[PDB]
mmCIF file of C-alpha atoms in Angstrom:
data_model
loop_
_atom_site.group_PDB
_atom_site.id
_atom_site.type_symbol
_atom_site.label_atom_id
_atom_site.label_comp_id
_atom_site.label_asym_id
_atom_site.label_seq_id
_atom_site.Cartn_x
_atom_site.Cartn_y
_atom_site.Cartn_z
ATOM 1 C CA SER A 15 -23.954 -38.342 -128.569
ATOM 2 C CA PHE A 16 -20.743 -37.029 -130.545
ATOM 3 C CA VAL A 17 -17.701 -37.839 -131.442
ATOM 4 C CA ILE A 18 -14.468 -35.958 -130.809
ATOM 5 C CA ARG A 19 -10.583 -36.122 -130.508
ATOM 6 C CA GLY A 20 -9.598 -38.232 -127.426
ATOM 7 C CA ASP A 21 -7.682 -35.452 -125.630
ATOM 8 C CA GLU A 22 -10.777 -33.226 -125.582
ATOM 9 C CA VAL A 23 -13.052 -35.607 -123.229
ATOM 10 C CA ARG A 24 -11.386 -34.076 -120.036
ATOM 11 C CA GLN A 25 -14.019 -31.050 -120.487
ATOM 12 C CA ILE A 26 -16.868 -33.210 -120.661
ATOM 13 C CA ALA A 27 -17.720 -32.410 -116.596
ATOM 14 C CA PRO A 28 -20.000 -29.941 -114.671
ATOM 15 C CA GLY A 29 -18.311 -26.296 -114.156
ATOM 16 C CA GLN A 30 -15.392 -27.139 -116.932
ATOM 17 C CA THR A 31 -13.511 -24.825 -119.454
ATOM 18 C CA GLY A 32 -11.967 -24.920 -122.788
ATOM 19 C CA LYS A 33 -12.768 -25.318 -126.564
ATOM 20 C CA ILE A 34 -15.465 -27.589 -126.091
ATOM 21 C CA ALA A 35 -16.725 -26.188 -123.136
ATOM 22 C CA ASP A 36 -16.765 -22.891 -124.704
ATOM 23 C CA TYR A 37 -17.697 -23.673 -128.221
ATOM 24 C CA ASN A 38 -19.537 -27.012 -128.750
ATOM 25 C CA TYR A 39 -20.948 -28.538 -125.483
ATOM 26 C CA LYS A 40 -21.281 -28.194 -121.656
ATOM 27 C CA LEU A 41 -22.807 -29.551 -118.415
ATOM 28 C CA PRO A 42 -24.297 -27.568 -115.648
ATOM 29 C CA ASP A 43 -22.120 -26.864 -112.478
ATOM 30 C CA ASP A 44 -24.880 -29.520 -110.840
ATOM 31 C CA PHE A 45 -25.218 -32.376 -113.598
ATOM 32 C CA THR A 46 -26.747 -35.490 -112.444
ATOM 33 C CA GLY A 47 -25.733 -38.403 -115.216
ATOM 34 C CA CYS A 48 -22.995 -40.116 -116.329
ATOM 35 C CA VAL A 49 -20.159 -39.633 -119.002
ATOM 36 C CA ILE A 50 -19.257 -42.490 -121.104
ATOM 37 C CA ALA A 51 -16.396 -42.520 -123.716
ATOM 38 C CA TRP A 52 -13.960 -44.990 -126.233
ATOM 39 C CA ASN A 53 -11.894 -44.765 -128.864
ATOM 40 C CA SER A 54 -13.103 -45.562 -132.105
ATOM 41 C CA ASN A 55 -10.674 -45.965 -135.054
ATOM 42 C CA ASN A 56 -12.897 -47.779 -137.284
ATOM 43 C CA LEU A 57 -14.450 -44.135 -138.276
ATOM 44 C CA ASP A 58 -10.606 -42.688 -138.734
ATOM 45 C CA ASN A 59 -11.164 -38.956 -142.040
ATOM 46 C CA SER B 1 -11.659 6.238 -62.821
ATOM 47 C CA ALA B 2 -14.741 6.756 -60.631
ATOM 48 C CA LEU B 3 -16.826 5.862 -63.485
ATOM 49 C CA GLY B 4 -15.233 2.993 -64.584
ATOM 50 C CA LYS B 5 -18.615 0.535 -64.510
ATOM 51 C CA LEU B 6 -20.089 3.164 -67.262
ATOM 52 C CA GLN B 7 -16.836 3.260 -69.186
ATOM 53 C CA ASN B 8 -16.534 -0.352 -69.272
ATOM 54 C CA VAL B 9 -19.969 -0.546 -71.057
ATOM 55 C CA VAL B 10 -18.322 1.941 -73.791
ATOM 56 C CA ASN B 11 -15.049 0.052 -73.835
ATOM 57 C CA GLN B 12 -16.681 -3.222 -74.088
ATOM 58 C CA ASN B 13 -18.970 -2.384 -77.034
ATOM 59 C CA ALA B 14 -15.924 -0.846 -78.954
ATOM 60 C CA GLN B 15 -14.051 -4.093 -78.505
ATOM 61 C CA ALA B 16 -16.491 -6.185 -79.489
ATOM 62 C CA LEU B 17 -17.419 -4.305 -83.165
ATOM 63 C CA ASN B 18 -13.893 -3.965 -83.822
ATOM 64 C CA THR B 19 -12.945 -7.442 -83.257
ATOM 65 C CA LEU B 20 -15.822 -8.745 -85.475
ATOM 66 C CA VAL B 21 -14.605 -6.106 -88.097
ATOM 67 C CA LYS B 22 -11.064 -7.651 -87.751
ATOM 68 C CA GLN B 23 -12.299 -11.021 -88.214
ATOM 69 C CA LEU B 24 -13.055 -10.073 -91.903
ATOM 70 C CA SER B 25 -9.141 -10.113 -92.823
ATOM 71 C CA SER B 26 -8.437 -13.860 -91.341
ATOM 72 C CA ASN B 27 -7.964 -16.813 -93.954
ATOM 73 C CA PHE B 28 -9.903 -19.835 -92.002
ATOM 74 C CA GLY B 29 -7.702 -21.947 -94.197
ATOM 75 C CA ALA B 30 -8.862 -20.137 -97.542
ATOM 76 C CA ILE B 31 -6.381 -19.050 -100.478
ATOM 77 C CA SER B 32 -7.160 -15.446 -99.394
ATOM 78 C CA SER B 33 -9.298 -13.401 -97.147
ATOM 79 C CA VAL B 34 -10.258 -11.025 -99.990
ATOM 80 C CA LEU B 35 -13.214 -12.418 -101.616
ATOM 81 C CA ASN B 36 -12.923 -10.946 -105.186
ATOM 82 C CA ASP B 37 -9.126 -12.712 -105.552
ATOM 83 C CA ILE B 38 -10.791 -16.158 -104.858
ATOM 84 C CA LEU B 39 -13.627 -15.282 -107.801
ATOM 85 C CA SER B 40 -10.632 -13.939 -109.948
ATOM 86 C CA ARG B 41 -7.916 -16.477 -109.410
ATOM 87 C CA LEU B 42 -9.826 -19.824 -109.620
ATOM 88 C CA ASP B 43 -12.467 -21.493 -111.989
ATOM 89 C CA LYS B 44 -15.774 -22.109 -110.129
ATOM 90 C CA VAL B 45 -15.303 -25.808 -108.934
ATOM 91 C CA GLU B 46 -12.378 -24.274 -107.068
ATOM 92 C CA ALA B 47 -13.872 -20.996 -106.051
ATOM 93 C CA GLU B 48 -16.661 -22.469 -104.446
ATOM 94 C CA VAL B 49 -14.542 -24.697 -102.020
ATOM 95 C CA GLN B 50 -12.367 -21.796 -100.887
#
């Protein structure tokens, strides 16, 4: 569980690259699982 | 040309090995036949498909 800006979500996938994938959170190239996301402006900071 | 049977064994062994080496240069539909191009031009998820 984490919060990011909405544009970064495209990096939350097996074998991806970019700022989040390089420096915060990465999935293995053979990941088994689900990625779930939503806009949360009640937290908008 | 009297020994054409023995010269055929020599020629067929050479032709088969030359074809086996030449087939390294073919694409087979891949982006390049050079394996280090694919690994340097593409990210892993695309490179493994190529």
